[PDB]
Design a protein around this ligand. Sequence first.
Ligand code: GDP
Length: 384
Amino acid sequence: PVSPLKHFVLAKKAITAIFDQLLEFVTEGSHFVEATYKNPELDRIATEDDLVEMQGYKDKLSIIGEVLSRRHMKVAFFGRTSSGKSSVINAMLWDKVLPSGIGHITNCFLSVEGTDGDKAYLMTEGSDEKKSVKTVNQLAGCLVRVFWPKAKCALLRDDLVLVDSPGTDVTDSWIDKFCLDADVFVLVANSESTLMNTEKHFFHKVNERLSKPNIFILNNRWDASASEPEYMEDVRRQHMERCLHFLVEELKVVNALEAQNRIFFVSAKEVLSARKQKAALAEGFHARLQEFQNFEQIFEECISQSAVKTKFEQHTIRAKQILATVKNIMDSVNLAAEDKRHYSARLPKEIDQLEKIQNNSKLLRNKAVQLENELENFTKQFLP
Ligand SMILES: Nc1nc2c(ncn2[C@@H]2O[C@H](COP(=O)(O)OP(=O)(O)O)[C@@H](O)[C@H]2O)c(=O)[nH]1
């Protein structure tokens, strides 16, 4: 069972390798354009504008590679205090990463990301110090970053970052600082209550600022109706009706069939206890566990596909534009050299020098075409 998050990992590896090659190619092409422009025996074969363009591309292709190397998937959890946001995150991480009662006292956002080390730690905004996660109660707009060993959670190994927000009912400017790059928003609701307008309004604001945000609703604490099956079915219908209407008719972010794959009824407490033990069950436990596992699979499929487009499409488009321009420059150099060869070149040494320029510009043009093909292959595989 291969995690869908590997789609993102593979896309990130592919696009970073393309940009490594692109930087090397533009560096080589810039050296060629410079030598051609600077040759005192050549007039107007490569222009000063040709060189400035190539150097400008060279000067900015490195930071694209470094920026791409740090791209990650991000899921953000929202909901009323004690709905179960921290517990859902812990269940997905298979451990008690965010401590008990942290939701009572946290007024900062808490993010969880992977670390290559074997020791968990946290970092605050104004330093590089790695602090004990045992101080997270003291440290928790503000953001506290929790780092958890990648060897312990496959989600973190596969470049997912999970963000816990302060309770919606006791606090937006949240969107700008910690939501412009979130790929998925998860509303955690208390299934013993009813979906509230305070929660709806927040996702209305996300919806107005982002084009078709990916939104899941987890009706948590579903174990509270265990052994009440007839009751459970009717409460499920009522929650489903209200959650469907919100996603489909109010937000209009999903049609009614796809909405079935965005609303789930779960017990994060049961799931965490089952998973911490893996490293006398209430009635319906396994059905609820299976529903949480189905949510995780659908969530991973959603966020991996979505994040590849969101995080990598613009730079893929830019790389194609850079290559088209470099090809145009190589075309211009070749054409100017060949024109000169046939219009006014006289001595066989001048002719041989122009033929070398033609040949090297063609070698570079063909290298650009090969990188265009790699970008087309990337687009076909990763950018539907
Ligand atoms: N019965 C039950 N209790 C839960 C569930 N999820 C969380 N809780 C409990 O509800 C309390 C608050 O949960 P927490 O995850 O801290 O809520 P948060 O404030 O939204 O982060 C804690 O005591 C949890 O143990 C659940 O699925 N079922």
